[PDB]
Amino acid sequence: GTRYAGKVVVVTGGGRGIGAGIVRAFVNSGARVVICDKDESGGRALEQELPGAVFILCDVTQEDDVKTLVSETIRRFGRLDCVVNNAGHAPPPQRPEETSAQGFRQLLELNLLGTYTLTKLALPYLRKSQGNVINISSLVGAIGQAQAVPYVATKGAVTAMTKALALDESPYGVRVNCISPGNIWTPLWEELAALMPDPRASIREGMLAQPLGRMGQPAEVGAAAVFLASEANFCTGIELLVTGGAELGYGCKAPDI
Numbered sequence: 001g002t003r004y005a006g007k008v009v010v011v012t013g014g015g016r017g018i019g020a021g022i023v024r025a026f027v028n029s030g031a032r033v034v035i036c037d038k039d040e041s042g043g044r045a046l047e048q049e050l051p052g053a054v055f056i057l058c059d060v061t062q063e064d065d066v067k068t069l070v071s072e073t074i075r076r077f078g079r080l081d082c083v084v085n086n087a088g089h090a091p092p093p094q095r096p097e098e099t100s101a102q103g104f105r106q107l108l109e110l111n112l113l114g115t116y117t118l119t120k121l122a123l124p125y126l127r128k129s130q131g132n133v134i135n136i137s138s139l140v141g142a143i144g145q146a147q148a149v150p151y152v153a154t155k156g157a158v159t160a161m162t163k164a165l166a167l168d169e170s171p172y173g174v175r176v177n178c179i180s181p182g183n184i185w186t187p188l189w190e191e192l193a194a195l196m197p198d199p200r201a202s203i204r205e206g207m208l209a210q211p212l213g214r215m216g217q218p219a220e221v222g223a224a225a226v227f228l229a230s231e232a233n234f235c236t237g238i239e240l241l242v243t244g245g246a247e248l249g250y251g252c253k254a255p256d257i
């Protein structure tokens with residue numbers, strides 16, 4: 001591919017799931033991709049598989065890891081055009097009274113402050129390249145979700161932070177956008193479903209939450225990311241929904257008393 005040829009892209013959480021879909025899409029578009037992930041399994045295999053992708057073991061919650069991620073990307077490839085902040089975690093369902101401030105703080109560290117830290121360290125280089133930031137948020141930041149108060153709050157923060165940073169970096173020509181996936185079939189989805197009483201039913205429910213009648217694929221999030229990096233040159237501060245229409249219309253969510 002040539003749509004994003006000569007460009008260098010960092011994808012956090014890139015070893016599996018949505019992240020690996022985004023890595024593949026960018027490689028297919030002609031870019032060099034640095035896969036950042038805290039687990040070795042998936043990311044190392046992806047580096048062997050894809051000419052054009054390399055793996056760096058990095059925990060975005062560790063500032064030293066992130067500093068090294070950026071410095072190694074520049075040392076090895078000479079530029080930085082796009083950061084995709086995909087690293088994140090969705091805990092299992094929790095009733096509000098079962099959450100804790102400390103668990104909430106830890107989830108903020110992963111889902112919000114890791115995105116903040118890498119973006120900050122990358123922006124001097126993105127300014128030089130007129131590059132861009134893509135944050136992976138979630139539809140539930142916009143419309144809520146039951147049994148996930150901390151998770152929703154973190155994604156509401158990521159989406160808002162995208163718009164604020166877009167304002168700040170617009171004079172420097174650096175675009176900042178987010179993607180808000182709905183239900184995407186991934187290893188996180190399959191694991192969360194396995195903890196449920198009937199996993200088959202939970203997956204069936206997840207497919208029917210979308211008018212399209214299926215869950216989405218990592219490749220579809222990847223295509224949205226490549227669009228935002230390579231062809232969305234008048235888009236900044238937008239929230240690109242990749243949800244199969246989940247937010248549309250009335251549904252089962254629960255005569256006037």
Ligand SMILES: NC(=O)c1ccc[n+]([C@@H]2O[C@H](COP(=O)([O-])OP(=O)(O)OC[C@H]3O[C@@H](n4cnc5c(N)ncnc54)[C@H](O)[C@@H]3O)[C@@H](O)[C@H]2O)c1
Nearest residue numbers: 013015016017018037038059060088138181183184186188
């Ligand atoms: N799957 C969905 O339906 C869905 C929906 C909306 C938003 N999202 C978001 O998409 C992103 C990816 O989710 P997924 O479903 O592919 O998850 P996943 O668990 O299948 O993959 C996430 C990847 O990130 C890595 N990771 C986790 N913590 C990390 C850290 N501290 N540093 C670096 N890498 C780390 C994991 O090792 C893993 O490879 C997350 O931000 C998630 O909140 C997912």
